[PDB]
Design a protein around this ligand. Structure first.
Ligand SMILES: CN[C@@H]1CCc2c(ccc(O)c2O)[C@H]1O
Lengths: 329, 231, 50, 281
């Protein structure tokens, strides 16, 4: 029974150990440091009532979407600070939000177990339901497909018109809390309450790889722009960068001073900077190749809950529990 | 041209006015949470209060919202409820003998320990309800399951003379109920931002709404007093 | 159950030396470094927010 | 020697008032987390204390040290008006803060709807309007001047400029500025202390197994022992008496002045205020 599983685990551990010739730090020790980075709050939105939970930049580098515990989903224009739209949610709690690349649809879902989707040309076009538990994160593959992460330890791939789960990516111990998409639509990964963070293929529907190798409670995942690597934030103080081709770890971003975990992780456009929000009121940035902190961002009144870097790389927007979204450049 | 900017500013002004109205409507509404076991009888308390499931009731022109999260052993949605005035906790005081393949009451005590010593909700009080008081009285009077069989602390436990009991006409059920209350009280006191408010209630009783109203009022008063440093 | 089959499928996969992957990531970061406005200097006129 | 020593004390008082009130105003304005319903009243009190400490304390010190007033008669009237306005506004804002505290404690459910940003702004505007009326209207219109020959000679004199007032204006200014706020403050703080004692008794009974007295004591002490003697001497000297010398009157007035510098270090003792001050400095 479990003997085969133990043998397989030993085999994969041996393969990972054999494949690890020289660590990333060993190669990167001869690379110029990024140096100190000064980030200033260019514009503060401050148009929210309660603590906000998640945000998502639009395909254009301007528009925003933020969801708060007040139950109101407000679309924000970063350049002008004017509120383009304010779509109330039937559920008072919205655990996440998403902006479609088309821009004609916005999805927000929370503890209601329904991934409500709004049409911007603001009415609920279709509400997708079928998850046993709460939702954690939603992303748009296209204008007609959306992948949701549920508290039932399953991730699903929906179709808007059909309204049914096209594929269910079962096989996870803990509840998934965050997922990210590859630059292409073929692959996407997620990390659960269990330390395991697995890679999935939207076509096959099977977990191609499983990394884990973390303490507990992975809370945020982002893709390196190249798509060959992804970084996981966890309730442990450390933040790690994995690797799909090597199927193992590369570097661990930990500091003695920090004792809180991670809440959101997002790379820069070039991938050199790994911006990671913290349970502490201030966000931290890391040199993705040197594993050295570059500069602490300004703090909010409460803990941060989301990060987002523009598709053009213009600025990074962080929204905390203080109901304030502070665009940083 | 500037016409688009003017239209966007007008839309922003309208949205801001609607947001201000919504803030005025919402800041006066108090949020409560139901966190009870499946066998704890939370349905009876919900029915009493009405007379994710959201229940809205108004007492003395004050609006309340009551949210029940509905296994979920690893409670990660608890951190979401940080703005609620109080957390309504329901535990069946008659479920001491019931055993889960650890007594159910001990499981409720562990759940209360987990809730109390939570980093995210450290300023959220707990309103405690103990349903099935009649069932507990019947179990104690019958003696089929000795109270000391599962709880060894009953050997040295004595009834508190300070606490005046209800006219239950039996010292034994009174001692058992007060021991069950004192377990939760000790667990809560082991940790002064938030307080625990035990209550002995029965399914027949319908005065729980006034109890919740008064307790929430006292919670807000204590929060304000500690904010101004008078307590 | 199916866990054994999933583990067996996961075990059989082609892997590359971690040095090659680290070198590829470093090469990508060096090649696309100039594109990122956050890492590189941002002109006052270029910055849409100021 | 005595005048040289008196200069150090006055300069220290002016510097302390200015520094404390500037720090409080900067902490309230710079950080958006400090802004609140009651912090609007706190910053109004800080602004009043700052303007009084910047305007009238240095000029009063210059008057007392040099024993003569160099500036013009109109400027002396302006200085007196600014002094009365600032003192009245400060004490009225103390009363308003106490009323807000009482309404937040004894009426918790209705507190959120009763007080809002618009309501706080309206209340502060009304306080400043009534203070400006009570100060400027009877001063610039020559209503407060007395019928004594000495008062007329002092008013006509250019250099010497002391304070001479009618019995009616002195009584009205005292009752508007201190006495009515004193009664309101005592009533609301008695009710708040009763509520706190009830809550402490209930918490002691329920849990089984003070601070409110000390806080109310320090607040009421630093208000009363600072302002009440001057505002009883005002009525005494106005109402058929000659035992109040100029030195006693000025000493009590300056005690009332230093009350303004004492206020911020007790009305901004919150941990959030301490953290904001640490961040600023
Ligand atoms: C500069 N001396 C003035 C004269 C009278 C007066 C003061 C303060 C508050 C009042 O309500 C007053 O009527 C004193 O500060």
């Amino acid at each position: 029974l479990r003997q085969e599983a133990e043998q397989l685990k030993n085999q994969i551990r041996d393969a990972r150990k054999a494949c690890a010739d020289a660590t990333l730090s060993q190669i990167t020790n001869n690379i110029d440091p990024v140096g100190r980075i000064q980030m200033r709050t260019r514009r503060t939105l401050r148009g929210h009532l309660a603590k906000i939970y998640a945000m998502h930049w639009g395909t254009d580098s301007r528009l925003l979407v933020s969801a708060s515990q007040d139950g109101k989903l407000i679309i924000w224009d970063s350049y002008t600070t004017n509120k383009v739209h304010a779509i109330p949610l039937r559920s008072s709690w919205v655990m996440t939000c998403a902006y479609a690349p088309s821009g004609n649809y916005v999805a927000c879902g929370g503890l209601d177990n329904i991934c409500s989707i709004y049409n911007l040309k603001v009415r609920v076009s279709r509400e997708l339901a079928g998850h046993t538990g709460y939702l954690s994160c939603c992303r748009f593959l296209d204008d007609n497909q959306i992948v949701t992460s549920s508290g039932d330890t399953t991730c699903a791939l929906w179709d808007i018109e059909t309204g049914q789960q096209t594929t269910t990516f079962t096989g996870h111990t803990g509840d998934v809390m965050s997922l990210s998409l590859a630059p292409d639509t073929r692959l996407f990964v997620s990390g659960a309450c269990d330390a395991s963070a697995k890679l999935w293929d939207v076509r096959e529907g099977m977990c191609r790889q499983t990394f884990t190798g973390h303490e507990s409670d992975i809370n945020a995942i982002c893709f390196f722009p190249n798509g060959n690597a992804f970084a996981t934030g966890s309730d442990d103080a450390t933040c790690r960068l994995f690797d799909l081709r090597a199927d193992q770890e590369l570097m661990t971003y930990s500091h003695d001073n920090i004792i809180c975990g991670i809440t959101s992780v997002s790379f820069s456009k070039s991938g050199r900077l790994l911006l990671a929000g913290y349970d502490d009121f201030n966000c931290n940035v890391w040199d993705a190749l040197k594993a050295d902190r570059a500069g602490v961002l300004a703090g909010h009144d409460n803990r941060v809950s989301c990060l987002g870097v523009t598709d053009d790389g213009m600025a990074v927007a962080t929204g905390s529990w203080d109901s304030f979204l502070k665009i940083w450049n | 041209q500037r016409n688009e900017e003017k239209a966007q500013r007008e839309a922003n002004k309208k949205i801001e006015k609607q947001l201000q109205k919504d803030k005025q409507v919402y800041r006066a509404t108090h949020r409560l949470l139901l966190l009870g076991a499946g066998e704890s009888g939370k349905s009876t308390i919900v029915k009493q209060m009405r007379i994710i499931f959201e229940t809205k009731f108004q007492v003395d022109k004050v609006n309340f919202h009551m949210f029940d999260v509905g296994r979920d052993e690893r409670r990660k949605w608890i951190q979401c409820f940080n703005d609620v005035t109080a957390i309504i906790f329901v535990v069946a005081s008659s479920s001491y003998n019931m055993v889960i393949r650890t007594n159910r009451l001990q499981e409720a005590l562990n759940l209360f320990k987990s809730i109390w010593n939570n980093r995210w909700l450290r300023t959220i009080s707990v309103i405690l309800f103990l349903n099935k008081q009649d069932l507990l009285a019947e179990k104690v009077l019958a003696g089929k399951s000795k109270i000391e069989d599962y709880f060894p602390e009953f050997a040295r436990y004595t009834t508190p003379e300070d606490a005046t009991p209800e006219p239950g006409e039996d010292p034994r059920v009174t001692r058992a109920k007060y021991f069950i209350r004192d377990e939760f009280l000790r667990i809560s006191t082991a940790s002064g931002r938030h307080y625990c408010y035990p209550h002995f209630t029965c399914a027949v009783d319908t005065e729980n709404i006034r109890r919740v109203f008064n307790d929430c009022r006292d919670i807000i008063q204590r929060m304000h007093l500690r904010q101004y440093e008078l307590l | 159950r199916k866990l054994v089959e999933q583990l067996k499928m996961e075990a059989n996969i082609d892997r590359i030396k971690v040095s090659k992957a680290a070198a590829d990531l470093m090469a990508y970061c060096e090649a696309h470094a100039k594109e990122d406005p956050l890492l590189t200097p941002v002109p006052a006129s270029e910055n849409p927010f100021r | 020697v005595w005048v040289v020593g008196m200069g150090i004390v006055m300069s220290l008082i002016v510097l302390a008032i200015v520094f404390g009130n500037v720090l409080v105003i900067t902490a309230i304005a710079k950080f958006e987390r400090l802004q609140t319903v009651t912090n609007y009243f706190i910053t109004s009190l800080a602004c009043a204390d700052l303007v009084m400490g910047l305007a009238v304390v240095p000029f009063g010190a210059a008057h007392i040290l040099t024993k003569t007033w160099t500036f013009g008669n109109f400027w002396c009237e302006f200085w007196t008006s600014i002094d009365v306005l600032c003192v009245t506004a400060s004490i009225e804002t103390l009363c308003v803060i106490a009323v807000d505290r009482y309404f937040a404690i004894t009426s918790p459910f209705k507190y959120q709807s009763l007080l809002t940003k618009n309501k706080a702004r309206v209340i502060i505007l009304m306080v400043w309007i009534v203070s400006g009326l009570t100060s400027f209207l009877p001063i610039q219109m020559h209503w407060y001047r007395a019928t004594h020959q000495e008062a007329i000679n002092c008013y006509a004199e250019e250099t010497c400029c002391d304070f001479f007032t009618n019995q009616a204006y002195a009584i009205a200014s005292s009752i508007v500025s201190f006495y009515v706020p004193l009664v309101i403050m005592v009533f609301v703080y008695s009710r708040v202390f009763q509520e706190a004692k009830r809550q402490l008794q209930k918490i002691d009974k329920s849990e089984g197994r003070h601070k409110a007295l000390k806080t109310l004591g320090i607040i009421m002490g630093t208000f009363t022992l600072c302002w009440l003697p001057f505002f009883i001497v005002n009525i005494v000297h106005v109402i058929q008496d000659n035992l109040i010398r100029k030195e006693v009157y000025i000493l009590l007035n300056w005690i009332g002045y230093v009350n303004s510098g004492f206020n911020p270090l007790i009305y901004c003792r919150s941990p959030d205020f301490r953290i904001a001050f640490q961040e600023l400095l």
